[PDB]
Amino acid sequence: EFYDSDVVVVGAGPTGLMLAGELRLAGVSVVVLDKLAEPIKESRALGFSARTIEEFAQRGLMDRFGEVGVIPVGHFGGVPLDYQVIEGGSYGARGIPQARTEGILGGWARELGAEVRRGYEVTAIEDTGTSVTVEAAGADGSPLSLRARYVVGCDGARSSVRKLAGIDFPGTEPAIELRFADVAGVQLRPRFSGERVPGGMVMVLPMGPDRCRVIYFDSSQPLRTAPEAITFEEVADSWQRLTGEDISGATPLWVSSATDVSRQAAQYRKGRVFLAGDAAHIHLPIGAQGMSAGVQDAVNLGWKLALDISGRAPQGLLDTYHSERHPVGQRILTNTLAQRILYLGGDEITPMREVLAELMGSHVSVQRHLAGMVTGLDIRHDVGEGDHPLLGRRLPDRELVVDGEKIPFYSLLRPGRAVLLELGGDRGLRTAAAGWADRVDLVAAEFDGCEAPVDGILVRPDGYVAWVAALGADGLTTALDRWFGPTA
Amino acid sequence: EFYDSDVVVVGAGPTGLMLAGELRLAGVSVVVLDKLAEPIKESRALGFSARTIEEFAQRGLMDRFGEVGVIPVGHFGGVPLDYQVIEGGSYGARGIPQARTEGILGGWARELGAEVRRGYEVTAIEDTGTSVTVEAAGADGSPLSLRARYVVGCDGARSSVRKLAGIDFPGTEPAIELRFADVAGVQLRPRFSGERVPGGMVMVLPMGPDRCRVIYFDSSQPLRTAPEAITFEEVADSWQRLTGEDISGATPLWVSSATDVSRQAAQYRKGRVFLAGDAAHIHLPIGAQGMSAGVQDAVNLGWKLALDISGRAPQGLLDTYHSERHPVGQRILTNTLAQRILYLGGDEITPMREVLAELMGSHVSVQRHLAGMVTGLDIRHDVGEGDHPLLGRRLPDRELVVDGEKIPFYSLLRPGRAVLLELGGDRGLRTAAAGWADRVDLVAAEFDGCEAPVDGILVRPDGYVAWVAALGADGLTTALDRWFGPTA
Ligand SMILES: Cc1cc2nc3c(=O)[nH]c(=O)nc-3n(C[C@H](O)[C@H](O)[C@H](O)COP(=O)(O)OP(=O)(O)OC[C@H]3O[C@@H](n4cnc5c(N)ncnc54)[C@H](O)[C@@H]3O)c2cc1C
Numbered sequence: 001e002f003y004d005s006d007v008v009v010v011g012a013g014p015t016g017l018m019l020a021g022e023l024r025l026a027g028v029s030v031v032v033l034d035k036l037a038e039p040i041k042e043s044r045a046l047g048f049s050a051r052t053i054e055e056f057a058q059r060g061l062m063d064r065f066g067e068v069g070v071i072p073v074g075h076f077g078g079v080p081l082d083y084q085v086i087e088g089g090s091y092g093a094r095g096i097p098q099a100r101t102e103g104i105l106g107g108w109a110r111e112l113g114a115e116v117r118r119g120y121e122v123t124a125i126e127d128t129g130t131s132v133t134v135e136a137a138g139a140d141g142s143p144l145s146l147r148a149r150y151v152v153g154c155d156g157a158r159s160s161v162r163k164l165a166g167i168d169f170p171g172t173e174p175a176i177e178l179r180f181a182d183v184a185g186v187q188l189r190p191r192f193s194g195e196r197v198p199g200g201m202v203m204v205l206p207m208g209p210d211r212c213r214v215i216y217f218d219s220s221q222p223l224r225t226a227p228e229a230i231t232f233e234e235v236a237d238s239w240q241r242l243t244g245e246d247i248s249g250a251t252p253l254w255v256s257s258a259t260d261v262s263r264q265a266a267q268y269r270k271g272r273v274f275l276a277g278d279a280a281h282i283h284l285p286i287g288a289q290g291m292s293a294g295v296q297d298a299v300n301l302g303w304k305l306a307l308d309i310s311g312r313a314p315q316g317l318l319d320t321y322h323s324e325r326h327p328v329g330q331r332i333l334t335n336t337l338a339q340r341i342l343y344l345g346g347d348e349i350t351p352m353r354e355v356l357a358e359l360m361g362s363h364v365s366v367q368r369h370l371a372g373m374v375t376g377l378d379i380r381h382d383v384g385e386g387d388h389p390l391l392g393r394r395l396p397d398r399e400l401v402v403d404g405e406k407i408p409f410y411s412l413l414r415p416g417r418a419v420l421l422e423l424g425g426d427r428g429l430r431t432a433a434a435g436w437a438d439r440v441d442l443v444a445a446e447f448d449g450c451e452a453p454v455d456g457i458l459v460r461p462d463g464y465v466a467w468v469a470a471l472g473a474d475g476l477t478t479a480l481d482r483w484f485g486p487t488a
Numbered sequence: 489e490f491y492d493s494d495v496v497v498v499g500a501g502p503t504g505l506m507l508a509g510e511l512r513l514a515g516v517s518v519v520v521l522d523k524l525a526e527p528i529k530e531s532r533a534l535g536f537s538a539r540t541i542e543e544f545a546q547r548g549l550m551d552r553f554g555e556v557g558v559i560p561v562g563h564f565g566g567v568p569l570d571y572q573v574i575e576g577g578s579y580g581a582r583g584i585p586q587a588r589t590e591g592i593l594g595g596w597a598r599e600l601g602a603e604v605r606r607g608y609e610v611t612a613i614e615d616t617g618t619s620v621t622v623e624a625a626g627a628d629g630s631p632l633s634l635r636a637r638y639v640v641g642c643d644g645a646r647s648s649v650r651k652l653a654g655i656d657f658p659g660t661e662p663a664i665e666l667r668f669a670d671v672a673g674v675q676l677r678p679r680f681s682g683e684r685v686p687g688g689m690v691m692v693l694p695m696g697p698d699r700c701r702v703i704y705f706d707s708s709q710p711l712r713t714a715p716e717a718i719t720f721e722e723v724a725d726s727w728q729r730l731t732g733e734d735i736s737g738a739t740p741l742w743v744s745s746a747t748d749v750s751r752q753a754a755q756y757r758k759g760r761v762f763l764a765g766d767a768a769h770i771h772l773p774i775g776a777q778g779m780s781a782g783v784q785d786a787v788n789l790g791w792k793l794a795l796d797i798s799g800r801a802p803q804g805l806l807d808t809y810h811s812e813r814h815p816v817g818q819r820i821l822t823n824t825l826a827q828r829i830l831y832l833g834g835d836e837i838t839p840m841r842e843v844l845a846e847l848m849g850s851h852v853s854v855q856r857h858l859a860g861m862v863t864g865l866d867i868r869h870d871v872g873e874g875d876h877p878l879l880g881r882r883l884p885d886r887e888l889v890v891d892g893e894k895i896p897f898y899s900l901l902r903p904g905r906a907v908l909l910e911l912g913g914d915r916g917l918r919t920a921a922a923g924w925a926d927r928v929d930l931v932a933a934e935f936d937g938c939e940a941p942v943d944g945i946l947v948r949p950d951g952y953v954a955w956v957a958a959l960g961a962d963g964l965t966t967a968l969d970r971w972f973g974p975t976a
């Protein structure tokens with residue numbers, strides 16, 4: 001009763017491909033199932049956030065892009081602020097369309113050994129005490145039934161594993177309707193191009209000389225709550241419904257309607273069926289928050305579900321994914337709700353824009369909103385030892401020295417392993433506390449480049465800290481039982 | 489063609505009485521006209537803000553109250569924060585009903601020489617190039633026509649000088665309806681006493697053992713936009729309309745309905761007719777902001793309009809009242825709108841309460857919101873010389889020393905005069921720059937009690953700074969032309 005794959009990941013979106021890479025990184029047979037025989041080819045989210053730039057640099061993937069310029073001044077709710085006041089913060093990468101991100105993740109995942117299988121469509125699932133058998137419509141055979149120890153739903157907001165798997169997916173009543181298009185045809189000639197006029201609002205930002213990006217929301221009560229694909233009819237007629245400008249003669253690449261519905265499943269784990277990315281949470285899509293949040297979901301999940309399949313799988317793990325990403329989810333839904341109330345709203349939120357504009361004068365508020373939208377630092381995983389200094393917080397880039405070699409530690413998280421940084425001393429804690437050299441990485445160096453921290457840290461494969469130190473009376477090595485196993 | 493009074497102030501509300509005191513302080517015949525033959529006797533706004541405690545202490549009036557305890561932890565939009573992080577800030581006085589405030593202001597104004605005249609009702613006005621003739625219905629004669637150089641409207645939100653004087657009074661469409669009562673009769677037994685349930689919300693705070701304060705707003709679209717007095721019928725039936733609790737058997741002192749309409753006149757001066765207090769601006773009434781804002785209006789206006797009538801009335805003055813209080817007005821309307829959106833609102837503003845709760849962790853945000861609601865420090869009068877260090881900002885209490893006498897300077901602003909603080913040196917600037925000893929007050933002392941400022945300041949009668957200094961190349965004495973006259 002052998003398996004086809006330890007993990008069947010559903011959907012070759014950014015979330016699915018990232019997860020496949022993580023799993024495969026830590027030695028896990030993974031088959032990926034995607035409805036589409038070709039990727040969407042759609043430039044949806046221009047760029048991604050800076051916590052995501054770091055997830056990619058953790059694994060050494062930034063080269064695959066080519067041009068990784070970053071925007072220091074971004075916004076919150078439409079109030080532009082400087083992002084570089086947070087050490088390492090930024091508003092994210094500027095010009096990478098979703099197509100390019102999925103392209104390199106597909107390349108990386110098949111390069112690492114995953115079996116991407118396009119044209120397979122999940123139709124059913126059954127979950128037993130030792131496995132999961134899924135029902136996927138191959139191109140060749142009408143059905144084809146697969147078997148794995150785990151199935152992870154990385155399919156869309158209209159998730160399919162969610163419904164048959166039994167996941168409950170509650171959320172917020174919709175209040176605003178937003179429509180997107182890459183309009184390439186008869187161009188627009190806008191003069192009211194950012195105004196909150198009565199009826200709704202229009203925004204336009206160019207991305208090619210041919211193509212312009214139409215953001216188009218209207219001040220109404222929606223009627224078709226599900227965010228779905230539409231023709232140019234609605235976007236053009238509603239545009240003239242607000243502006244009196246006709247843009248009907250143009251030709252779109254694609255147009256879509258979405259609402260500010262925010263939903264999030266109550267459980268990220270239901271037996272052996274999972275949800276990562278937009279399968280787990282949805283919201284009003286802009287800023288690349290969905291792709292960024294899904295890629296970070298998948299990264300947090302990857303190494304956990306990876307060695308869960310092999311040995312060295314402790315008690316708490318694979319329930320720490322829910323425990324660490326569900327609050328993050330119910331928090332980004334709250335913050336995107338907040339931003340768009342304060343941004344899309346009319347004359348009731350004018351005071352809001354004013355007040356926050358005033359609060360952004362202060363840099364404590366700057367850094368607060370910084371970490372809120374970047375997802376770089378407000379993600380401090382509340383699950384830790386005492387949680388006081390930098391525990392569930394991530395570890396930022398810092399150069400290391402010759403005692404190991406020149407190599408700094410961003411390079412260290414690239415194999416999806418863990419790491420432990422010591423000073424060439426603390427020999428007892430260097431090896432009598434760590435003789436798991438294959439299990440994690442033990443590194444010896446005088447790593448103090450800049451001004452902020454001091455010695456005594458080992459970190460998780462996703463870049464989170466698990467053991468803060470100074471010599472604390474006893475050197476606690478049971479944190480390595482908290483996130484790894486007791487093996488010789 | 490002699491006058492009855494230099495100023496006819498209309499309305500013996502807090503604003504009118506305060507203004508009468510200021511005018512009369514600086515030597516101005518003032519007659520006050522109030523519709524009511526007896527004051528309202530209503531405990532409306534429990535306490536007042538701390539900029540108002542300072543206005544009263546400027547004139548040495550805090551004794552007339554008796555019990556001046558102050559609350560250090562207040563709120564913004566329902567988020568409680570510590571107010572004492574601002575030097576001198578607080579959430580204001582706790583237990584003073586509006587009745588007690590009007591009582592002592594009436595006592596002070598008639599003690600200083602004003603002629604309070606109850607039972608006189610303004611019915612008309614006519615404004616000529618040299619005077620104003622008003623039409624007031626005395627108790628004795630049916631009409632009685634009065635004449636003064638100026639008329640100041642310190643009557644209510646349903647102002648009467650506003651309409652005939654021709655003032656344009658635009659503002660915000662109403663969104664929420666709020667109702668107040670001092671319910672003294674069959675008491676309520678509340679268990680859902682602060683919840684934002686669907687339909688609206690209920691709040692109750694006790695003020696006597698008999699009487700409790702019913703705040704009662706409902707989540708609807710109002711129909712009678714004008715804020716007016718009502719019977720207990722509506723408050724009781726709407727209460728059960730939200731809670732299913734019947735409080736109909738009780739007996740109120742008074743009940744009133746109000747909306748979140750915020751209005752503000754475009755001009756505070758229209759010829760020789762004025763608006764101070766709720767005659768100039770209105771909003772959703774809670775927190776004592778209306779009485780506090782009106783009392784500060786009246787204080788800013790008082791000494792200006794006072795010596796405007798006598799000689800020594802410069803060019804810019806009596807247009808600086810509009811120039812200095814209209815932005816303050818259009819700002820408090822914005823901030824009360826903001827608070828109550830974030831407080832009274834339902835599930836759309838939940839993220840709002842969350843975000844500000846997070847931002848209040850930071851004390852820069854604390855002090856910002858501090859100064860916003862206290863009106864103690866965000867009122868920095870933008871009209872000044874360069875406006876850079878503490879110009880249009882007010883001057884806080886600080887002890888002075890024996891070179892004058894023990895007396896510190898809160899005592900100095902009590903005669904409604906100006907003042908100038910020097911160190912016993914700078915003799916040339918002490919008297920060759922200031923030989924207006926009667927016009928302003930020249931004080932000599934080593935005033936450095938605590939840590940914050942250094943020497944070189946003269947201040948306006950309302951407590952605002954007009955001449956910052958250090959020795960600046962030249963000692964500019966033309967600021968004394970900016971707010972006083974050139975007289976020997
Ligand atoms: C048209 C459009 C425009 C967008 N524009 C923006 C934007 O401008 N800014 C922004 O921030 N966000 C935007 N978004 C949202 C953002 O693109 C998504 O959040 C992002 O793609 C993350 O999705 P994911 O990683 O969960 O996978 P998704 O991209 O949601 O893809 C899910 C994958 O699962 C596959 N799948 C679905 N059903 C099945 C099935 N039964 N069997 C097998 N495979 C299946 C799908 O075909 C797809 O390959 C946009 C989304 C869309 C659709």
Ligand SMILES: Cc1cc2nc3c(=O)[nH]c(=O)nc-3n(C[C@H](O)[C@H](O)[C@H](O)COP(=O)(O)OP(=O)(O)OC[C@H]3O[C@@H](n4cnc5c(N)ncnc54)[C@H](O)[C@@H]3O)c2cc1C
Nearest residue numbers: 499501503523532533610643644765766773774775776778
């Ligand atoms: C019932 C009630 C409850 C309130 N509760 C609160 C509360 O809980 N918290 C809060 O912060 N604020 C509250 N307010 C608002 C606050 O009391 C007012 O903003 C405050 O009184 C400031 O008004 P004012 O100083 O401009 O004069 P007002 O108090 O408005 O009085 C105006 C005066 O002008 C007189 N007048 C009117 N028309 C004429 C005329 N034609 N001729 C002559 N005189 C005239 C009136 O009779 C009155 O004496 C309440 C107001 C009311 C009415």
